Design a protein around this nucleic acid. Structure first.
Ligand SMILES: [Zn+2]
Ligand SMILES: [Zn+2]
Ligand SMILES: [Zn+2]
Ligand SMILES: [Zn+2]
Lengths: 1266, 674
RNA sequence: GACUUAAUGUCACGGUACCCAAUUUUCUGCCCC
């Protein structure tokens, strides 16, 4: 009668469930499913605190299985005494059945017992089974048991604190994923009690017969798993945060900015990556200095207090919980409140796809099958343990439900009607210490999928079956056990954003933003895999070799849960495989407990320190020798690696990183954190890359537009090409994408360039100064392009058509149809080429004229011709009036596909300047280093990326934009209203010319062509690189040989054009072409010696005759739209545009000549790019002319139109060929500045000049002012 | 003065009515319901408690229609259908609790709730018990669910109440005179209200006759079989003929379609066939002076057994299936699946030569096996052509199934070393089927054909051992040839060539003597052969040998394949592409049968690739049942003289001394009938 | 000791929170009473 006290300790997060008795157990599916788990019973009436325990019946069952296995391995005898087969059948008629039925194969041997076991004499196996004792099933009565396994109590709670369920357990959800489709069929919930604190259990085992001591102790040492975890058995404040978040949300509501709460919660949870200094030291962005209203997010008045100050107060109040917890819960509460008030975007909520299947409680009545399994005598049973490291080659993601929804105990239930508002924010599974965790659930699911692939045949896992599945996959997993592993890294995860672009408008869908938390790339998780069997299968070794990374393997362990965007491709490292000889060295296995919970030491020890009975496995065949690997696993996913040469700035536009980083700037490039080994820490410099989501979406859009599948009403049950090779709600994708990491990054010495844009008012001609924004993209240049080395994976099974579609998408990317990142319409992220790696892909490698000019001539010789003798004076800028006739198309041309009748291609044109060109590089204010001697002097250089001059694509795009809008009578897109005169310029202009708000009322030809808000334009411009011409303008003198000190550029006052309230807005302001830069060039000494030296600007200029070449990529244009665009680009002889700074001084007169035009289409023969002849261009221009005539009411004559004549007069260069012509254009002097009449002293007087005449003179181009 | 809520509800109701048109395609119906339910939910988003009752009625109707548009993926009711019905029940509960006061709205609400609840009880008994449904139906009929002339749902309510033992005496005349009453519904009313057996029988004969033209996926099939089950449970005498009539209707319906021999799974087909078999067997247990009627009854029993054993399984495999491939093959699947799904949804939306059983050559005796779960005990029907007589015997298969499962579990781990369990299984077969060794049941020296039922396909019936102290092997006295069903038998009228073909794609190191040192020379043989080589056989030879370990699909028998090169040839590709094997003996050695089918769970409708060879015209397939060492099948192939005579002397009768020798000799069986 | 088991029968390591979504559209760093 030895009372053995037993200590049970766990090494993985085990599972526990509510007890619910036995009769009441059958009512609940969760308790019936979790009969093999630990049991939780409440103590108080509040259902908050209770006691955890493990039933002695479950421990007895595990020990009985251990005895069975131990006797089977030793041929039915332990320590020399033979044991019979025991009994595992209970006859219904003779007595009651056991509360648990086996439903499992039973190990058996060849008897060998001398006599049948009876009450007088029983074998140790029969003694341990408790067959011939005084205790049965009908009643407990008392301790008549020959062997009694008492109830196992949680030893960790060694206090009277009455531990709560939340402290010990955490709810989790687990899927059953369909192998064929990749989508989960159903799921179930469970509670995971942490083994770190509450992971030890104490119980007593009372054995009366001394004949079974050795067998019982050995079985205690041999049982390995219990309650869902590996184990060894030894014989010895939120409420205040929620209220404040509600207050913040209400303040945002009264500020009418509720949609900003999502990004506010995201940013607040992002501050956890930084320190406490972002709040304590006020390191948050302060916004633009000229904004005059503070930051758009951090300066929202929360009940009379700035949001930054409110956050500081909240941190001062809640510093007890910690910075990470405070930010996390504040963001979580804000997100939950936002979801509660606003939810539902895609309405994927007719029926909740969630299914709570629990294997139907394994309910059955008429099977009771006993299946004896007798291993052959003399067979060898060995256990192979594989120890390694799971290095994440890509940022992983293991999903978990929302912490507010898990809440073990009072868990959230989807039984409520209208199961909608599915969470748009997803968290990553983490340990209780914020350590990244790879659960053995997901690892085992991935292993099962890979073994099913390797075998080539397997079953979908059936639940509640009465017979063990005998498929080859299920046989191996029944003898394969793993371990839950966490990393030694606890820093918060990066949050990665995705959007849904509306194919009709190529713009973000409203409410499509959703986020996930990803672990850093490069983390290594411990890997443990054990296989107890008679022979290591070729399929398991094939799967390990598939997972293992080598010189040319890269590892293919697709763990995690977002493999479509390339998240969770792990790689086995430091693989060491050891084996136990369970037939001859099982005492050593029991003594060492199978190295359970000590696998880290096993991985980090030499062969000389191995425990006795454990030897390395020297028969692990290589990849080239495994048959399942070569035929089934190797060709499953084929990678296509390539590098993208981006000869333009690249802006992936991280959003929240611009709200938390102290740079105080609008848009910054996306970068990610990468973990490093050997010096274990996050790498100090983040790596710039294009998201795998952006890459995947780009290819998906390309394929959908090519096939026309994009833009379908829905893909709920679609089997189109795009759904087939990119997946849908009911099927996982067959192609997986990874990040386009920047490799050519340390060859710049300034990786990111600061480019700041601004929007120019159409009427005043000056910048708005409130819409000014600055982008901060990577400094990609045509001569030094950015190299983005990415890859994607293709599943085996694509036909010729699908592989051709993928190749066509890649070819489109190479051709530059789809630029990477934001602001692609102004030359950002333009792909200049591609270089497919020649190692992996083979089929992909196998699957890859005269001058044009316009002869139109516009005379415009009314006034300047008579001035050939002594010249006249013309006011620098005139206005164009086109009336209220604005034609808006409600049937806008969308972006779903390439319409057959619509032109698409690329215009290659060259730009030559007729006057010195000024394009300031406003990245720095002292580019010329002249501010040291001259204080407050604006010094600029010509715009350049990596030290080579070029014109920004935004400049050319805006200049063509205003030219086209003035030509086609489009509305004032960038009119600046809300300005007073001393109507407020709101009612001053007609409603027709106001900017278009939405797509309902229609879009102007300019707004339809170049695009407006929530409608991407169909014309994209690129940066104009420098080719030929003199490098600079010399201007020998007191200048640094390439710079000029321009005169004062005062703000355009909108009062000269509108002297009286009755007077209306004249129209668009244009600048005449003249040689007025000569007076500035010659008066260099007399311009910086005057008063006010701070308002002058010194900047680099280059001489006339410089050649800039840029591309104008157009797409889905109408027959006449292309002609109008060509006319805008090259309006003929003696007509040029104005570009850059100093337009009123005559600087920046650029002539654009269309070097060539190309056009591509879709044909069954896969027609490539083809260049149109001169006849087609002439036809397009003519048809655009007829379209203009139709709007109004062989060689085209544009001056016949009343307003096009004025436009071409405004843009007419008089000095192109007329040597005698040289008009003088100057701004009239205010009073006594340079009189060498024409003075503001008498120009507004009614007697001198009436208002009605001066307004008319401003609207007539080239009107003399004397 | 309509509002936005009223006009949106009207639009949703119009969409629901359009989706309630029986002419609507099932694929468009799903999108229509999604649109209507999206509208209704959008209204409910703003009026969680202020929503009008009629909108709640529309939501409940839409959820009911969602539930009826969800088909069972497998052999169990999907949880999505239950969830849809539950959501509709909750919405209609909120409709009822918000007492609008309108009598018509209350009647409509209770009708919708009762319909949802009867369907929910039909698919889930536990959550919607009989007592709760009875109380709800009583409340509905109290509320005014009496008009059977306009609403078929009210007729459904009345019939469901009749099924629940509730007195519908008052409404019987209205139910009968209603033009929308179904034939089965009228029969149930006659049997339950008036208890008029004669009228019910003569009126349900019409329903059974009309069932011929309705696909088995229709609701009326399930309801009819459930009515037969209820009649059998009530011990009514009407079920005996009803089961036979419905079985005949099922034969007529099944024979109309299915050129590739597949049927629709509806979970009551097996119950229907079991009841028909039991009814015919009970009719065969009467005292008739003439034996002709008894012989006809036993022949009918064999017909019932054979008609069930020649079709296939669940629908998720039908959806997945294979791409276009053969234009003839894919068209049949598309038509069958479309018509079956359309019939299933319409049920709820208003509204070569086949040899006869007696065509057996002289000197041959055939045995038909049938296991019915309702009776729970097996049947063996034998036909002796020489005596031209039919007789049947009974046996129990529960312990036999347990022993077979034991052998299967042991084999899947210790293949060669599990011979003792094979001997135990053979002894169990001999003990549980003593009629196989009875002279009266099977005459001595007769060539026996076996048509095994589901898990008896896996039993070595030729290797059964008689239950005697010195029991003789069944193989020693009779020549056994197996066959999945009698309908697979054909006539050996094909022309046999003079060449032998030896395909091979097995792993290197085996069969090297056969390939290089061709014993019979071979003409169009190959090494590392692909599916194209099998498809390129033009002249049908006397012997085609295929040596490639195949694979199985646990769900779709059409996807079981022989692992030849270029992806291997699958079960369906054999039917479409292979043509040149008319009357060709096959010694297919694809590393045992077990590779090609899944592992059984007393349901083995899965058919190996051998029956595909039988379908394409092969005269016989001499395969292997369980994996054996390669020299055994090599010696079988080298046995070129033209099976039990080989097994008798090779060592097949040596189970007493060397079970391993018995293991690898009994593994060979001949599939096909001369 | 109860909370808290039943005993000749617990594959729950018997189930991957899994599946679909381009942070992007639009904006000349411009200029006179
Ligand atoms: Zn014993
Ligand atoms: Zn399986
Ligand atoms: Zn699609
Ligand atoms: Zn417009």
């Amino acid at each position: 009668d030895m009372n053995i006290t037993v200590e049970l300790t766990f090494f993985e997060p085990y599972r526990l469930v509510e007890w619910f008795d036995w009769d009441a157990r059958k009512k609940s599916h969760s308790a019936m499913r979790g009969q093999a788990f630990a049991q939780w019973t409440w103590k108080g009436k509040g259902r908050t605190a209770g006691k955890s325990f493990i039933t002695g019946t479950l421990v007895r069952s595990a020990v009985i299985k251990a005895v069975e296995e131990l006797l089977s391995l030793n041929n039915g005898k332990w320590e020399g005494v033979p044991c019979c087969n025991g009994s595992f059948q209970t006859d219904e008629s003779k007595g009651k059945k056991p509360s648990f039925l086996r439903k499992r194969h039973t190990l058996q041997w060849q008897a060998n017992n001398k006599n049948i076991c009876d009450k007088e004499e029983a074998c140790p196996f029969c003694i341990l089974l408790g067959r011939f004792d005084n205790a049965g099933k009908v009643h407990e009565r008392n301790k008549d048991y020959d062997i009694h396994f008492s109830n196992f109590d949680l030893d960790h709670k060694q206090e009277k604190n009455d531990l709560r369920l939340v402290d010990i357990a955490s709810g989790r959800i687990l899927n059953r994923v369909d192998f064929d489709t990749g989508k989960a069929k159903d799921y179930f919930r469970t509670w995971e009690a942490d083994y770190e604190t509450y992971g030890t259990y104490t119980g007593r085992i009372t054995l009366r017969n001394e004949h079974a001591k050795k067998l019982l102790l050995a079985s205690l040492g041999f049982v390995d798993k219990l309650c869902g975890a590996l184990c060894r058995i030894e014989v010895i404040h939120n409420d205040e945060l929620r209220k404040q978040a509600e207050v913040i949300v209400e303040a945002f509501k009264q500020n009418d900015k509720l949609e900003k709460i999502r990004i506010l919660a995201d940013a607040i949870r992002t501050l956890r990556l930084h320190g406490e200094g972002v709040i304590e030291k006020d390191e948050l962005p302060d916004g633009k200095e000229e904004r005059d209203k503070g930051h758009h997010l951090w300066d929202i008045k929360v009940q009379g207090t700035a949001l930054r100050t409110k956050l500081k107060e909240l941190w001062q109040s809640n510093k007890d919980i910690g910075w990470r917890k405070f930010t996390e819960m504040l963001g979580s509460n804000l997100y939950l409140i936002y979801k509660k008030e606003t939810g539902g975007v895609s309405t994927r909520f007719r029926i909740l796809g969630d299914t709570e299947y629990y294997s139907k409680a394994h309910d059955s009545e008429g099977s009771d099958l006993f299946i004896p399994v007798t291993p052959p005598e003399g067979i060898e049973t060995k256990e192979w343990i594989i120890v390694g490291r799971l290095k994440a080659a890509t940022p992983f993601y293991f999903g978990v439900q929302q912490p507010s929804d898990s809440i073990p105990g009072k868990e959230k239930k989807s039984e409520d009607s209208l199961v909608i508002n599915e969470h748009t924010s997803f968290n990553i599974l983490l340990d209780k210490e914020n350590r990244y965790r790879i659960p053995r659930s997901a690892l085992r699911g991935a292993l099962r999928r890979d073994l099913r692939t390797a075998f080539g045949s397997g079953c979908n896992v059936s639940l509640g079956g009465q017979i063990l599945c005998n498929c080859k996959v299920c046989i191996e997993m029944r003898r394969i056990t793993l371990k839950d592993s966490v990393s030694d890294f606890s820093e918060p995860p990066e949050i990665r954003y995705r959007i849904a672009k509306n194919p009709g408008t190529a713009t973000v869908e409203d409410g499509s933003l959703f986020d996930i938390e990803v672990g850093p790339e490069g983390l290594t998780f411990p890997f443990v895999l054990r296989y107890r069997g008679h022979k290591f299968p070729e399929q398991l070794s094939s799967v390990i070799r598939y997972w293992e990374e080598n010189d040319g393997k890269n590892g293919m362990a697709w763990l995690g849960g977002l493999d479509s965007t390339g998240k969770g491709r792990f790689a086995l490292k430091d693989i060491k495989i050891f084996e136990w000889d369970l037939n001859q060295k099982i005492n050593e296995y029991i003594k060492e407990r199978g190295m359970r919970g000590k696998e880290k030491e096993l991985l980090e020890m030499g062969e000389s320190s191995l425990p006795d009975g454990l030897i390395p496995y020297k028969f692990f065949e290589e990849r080239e020798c495994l048959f399942p690997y070569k035929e089934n696993l190797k060709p499953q996913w084929s990678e296509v690696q390539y590098t993208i040469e981006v000869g333009s700035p690249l802006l992936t536009a991280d959003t929240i990183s611009a709200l938390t980083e102290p740079g105080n700037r609008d848009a910054i490039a996306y970068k990610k954190r990468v973990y490093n080994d050997g010096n274990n820490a996050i790498e100090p410099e983040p790596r710039f890359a294009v998201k795998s989501e952006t890459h995947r979406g780009i290819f998906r859009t390309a394929v959908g537009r090519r096939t026309g599948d994009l833009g379908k009403e829905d893909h709920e049950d679609c089997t189109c090409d795009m759904c087939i090779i990119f997946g849908n709600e009911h099927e996982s994708s067959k192609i997986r994408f990874e990040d386009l990491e920047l490799i050519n990054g340390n060859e710049f010495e300034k990786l990111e360039k600061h480019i700041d844009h601004v929007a120019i008012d159409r009427f005043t001609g000056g910048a708005l100064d409130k819409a000014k924004f600055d982008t901060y993209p990577l400094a990609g240049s045509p001569k030094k392009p950015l190299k983005l080395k990415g890859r994607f994976w293709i599943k085996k099974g694509f036909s010729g058509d699908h592989k051709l579609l993928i190749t066509t998408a890649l070819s489109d990317i190479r051709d530059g149809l789809y630029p990477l990142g934001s602001k692609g319409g102004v030359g950002y992220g333009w792909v200049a080429g591609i270089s497919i790696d020649d190692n992996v892909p083979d089929d992909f490698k196998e699957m890859i004229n005269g001058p044009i000019n316009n002869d139109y001539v516009h005379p415009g010789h009314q006034s300047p011709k008579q001035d050939h003798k002594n010249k006249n004076i013309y006011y620098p800028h005139y206005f164009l009036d086109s009336g209220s006739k604005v034609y808006r198309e409600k049937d806008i041309i969308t972006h779903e596909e390439f319409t057959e009748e619509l032109l698409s291609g690329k215009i290659n044109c060259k730009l030559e300047t007729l006057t010195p060109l000024i394009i300031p590089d406003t990245s720095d204010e002292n580019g010329l280093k002249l501010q040291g001697n001259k204080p407050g002097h604006k010094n600029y250089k010509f715009f350049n990326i990596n030290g080579e001059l070029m014109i920004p694509g935004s400049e050319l795009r805006g200049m063509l934009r205003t030219h086209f809008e003035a030509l086609t009578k489009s509305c004032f897109a960038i009119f600046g209203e809300d300005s007073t005169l001393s109507k407020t310029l709101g009612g001053k202009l007609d409603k027709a010319l106001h900017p278009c708000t939405g797509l309902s009322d229609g879009l102007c030809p300019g707004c339809h062509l170049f695009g407006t808000t929530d409608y991407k334009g169909r014309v994209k411009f690129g940066f104009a690189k420098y080719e030929n011409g003199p490098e600079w303008l010399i201007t020998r003198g007191n200048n640094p040989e390439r710079s000029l000190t321009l005169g004062v550029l005062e703000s355009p006052r909108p009062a000269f054009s509108i002297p009286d309230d009755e007077s209306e807005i004249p129209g668009r302001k244009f600048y005449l072409h003249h040689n007025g830069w000569r007076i500035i060039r010659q008066k260099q000494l007399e311009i910086r010696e005057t008063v006010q030296p701070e308002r002058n600007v010194t900047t680099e200029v280059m001489d006339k005759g410089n050649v800039f070449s840029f591309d104008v990529r157009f797409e889905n244009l109408r027959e006449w739209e292309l002609g109008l665009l060509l006319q805008s680009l090259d309006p003929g002889k003696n007509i040029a545009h104005k570009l850059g700074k100093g337009k009123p001084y005559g600087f920046g007169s650029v002539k654009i000549k269309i070097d060539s035009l190309h056009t591509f289409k879709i044909n069954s023969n896969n027609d490539k790019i083809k260049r149109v002849p001169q006849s087609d261009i002439r036809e397009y221009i003519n048809k655009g002319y007829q379209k203009l005539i139709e709007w109004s009411g062989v060689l085209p004559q544009w001056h016949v139109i009343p307003h096009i004549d004025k436009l071409y007069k405004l843009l007419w260069v008089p000095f192109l060929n007329d040597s005698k012509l040289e008009p003088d254009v100057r701004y009239p002097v205010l009073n006594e500045e340079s009189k060498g009449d024409y003075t503001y002293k008498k120009l507004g007087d009614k007697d001198n000049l009436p208002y009605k005449t001066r307004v008319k003179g401003l609207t007539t181009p080239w009107s003399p002012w004397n | 003065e309509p509002t936005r809520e009223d006009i949106d509800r009207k639009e949703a109701e119009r969409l629901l009515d359009e989706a309630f048109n029986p002419r609507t395609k099932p694929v468009d119906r799903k999108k229509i319901i999604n649109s209507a339910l999206k509208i209704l939910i959008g209204l409910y988003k703003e009026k969680k408690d202020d929503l009008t009752s009629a909108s709640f009625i529309s939501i409940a109707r839409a959820y009911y229609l969602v539930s009826i548009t969800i088909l069972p993926k497998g052999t169990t009711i999907p949880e999505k259908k239950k969830e849809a019905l539950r959501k509709g029940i909750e919405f209609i509960d909120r409709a009822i609790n918000k007492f609008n006061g309108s009598i018509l709205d209350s009647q409509r609400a209770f009708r919708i709730k009762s319909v949802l609840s009867i369907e929910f009880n039909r698919i889930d008994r536990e959550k919607c018990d009989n007592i709760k449904l009875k109380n709800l139906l009583n409340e509905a009929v109290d509320k005014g669910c009496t008009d059977f002339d306009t609403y078929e749902w009210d007729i459904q309510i009345a019939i469901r109440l009749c099924e629940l033992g509730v007195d519908m005496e008052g409404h019987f005349d209205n139910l009968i005179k209603s033009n929308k009453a179904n034939d089965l519904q009228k029969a149930k009313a006659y049997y339950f209200i008036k208890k008029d057996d004669h009228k019910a029988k003569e009126h349900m004969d019409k329903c059974t006759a009309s069932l011929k033209y309705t696909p088995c996926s229709h609701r009326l099939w399930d309801e009819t079989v459930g009515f037969i089950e209820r009649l059998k449970g009530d011990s009514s005498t009407l079920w005996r003929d009803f089961a036979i009539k419905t079985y005949r209707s099922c034969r007529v319906q099944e024979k109309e379609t299915g050129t590739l021999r597949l049927r629709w799974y509806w979970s009551r087909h097996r119950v229907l066939y079991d009841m028909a078999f039991l009814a015919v067997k009970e009719q065969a247990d009467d005292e008739e002076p003439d034996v002709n009627v008894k012989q006809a009854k036993i022949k009918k029993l064999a017909e019932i057994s054979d008609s069930l054993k020649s079709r296939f399984s669940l629908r998720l495999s039908d959806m997945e299936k294979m791409p276009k491939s053969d234009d003839e093959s894919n068209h049949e699947f598309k038509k069958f699946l479309d018509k079956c799904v359309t019939a299933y949804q319409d049920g709820y939306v208003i509204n070569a030569k086949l040899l006869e059983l007696t065509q057996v050559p002289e000197g041959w005796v055939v045995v038909h096996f049938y296991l019915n779960k309702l009776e729970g005990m097996g049947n063996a029907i034998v036909f002796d052509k020489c005596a031209n007589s039919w007789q049947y015997k009974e046996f129990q298969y529960k312990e036999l199934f347990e022993v077979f499962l034991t052998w299967q579990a042991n084999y899947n781990l210790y293949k060669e070393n599990a011979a003792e369990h094979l001997v135990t299984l053979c002894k169990k077969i001999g003990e549980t089927m003593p009629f196989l060794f009875c002279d009266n049941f099977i005459p001595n020296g007769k060539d026996v054909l076996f048509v095994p039922h589901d898990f008896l396909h896996r039993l070595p019936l030729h290797g059964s051992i008689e239950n005697k102290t010195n029991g003789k092997l069944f193989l020693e006295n009779h020549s056994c040839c197996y066959l999945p069903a009698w309908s697979f038998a054909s006539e050996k009228e094909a022309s046999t060539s003079d060449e032998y073909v030896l395909l091979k794609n097995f792993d290197q190191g085996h069969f090297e003597t056969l390939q290089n040192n061709q014993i019979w020379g071979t003409q169009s043989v190959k090494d590392g052969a692909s599916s194209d080589d099998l498809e390129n056989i033009r002249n049908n030879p006397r012997l085609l040998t295929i040596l490639c370990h195949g694979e199985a699909n646990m769900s779709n028998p059409f996807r079981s394949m022989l692992k030849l090169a270029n992806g291997g040839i699958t079960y369906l590709e054999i039917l479409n592409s292979v043509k040149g094997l008319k009357g060709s003996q096959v010694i297919l050695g694809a590393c045992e049968t077990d590779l090609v089918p899944p592992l059984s769970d007393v349901m083995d409708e899965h058919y190996s690739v051998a029956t595909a060879l039988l379908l394409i015209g092969a005269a016989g397939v001499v395969g292997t049942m369980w994996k054996v060492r390669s020299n055994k099948t090599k010696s079988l192939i080298e046995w070129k003289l033209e099976l039990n005579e080989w097994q008798k002397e090779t060592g097949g009768a040596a189970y007493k001394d060397h079970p391993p020798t018995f293991y690898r000799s009994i593994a060979f069986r001949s599939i096909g009938f001369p």
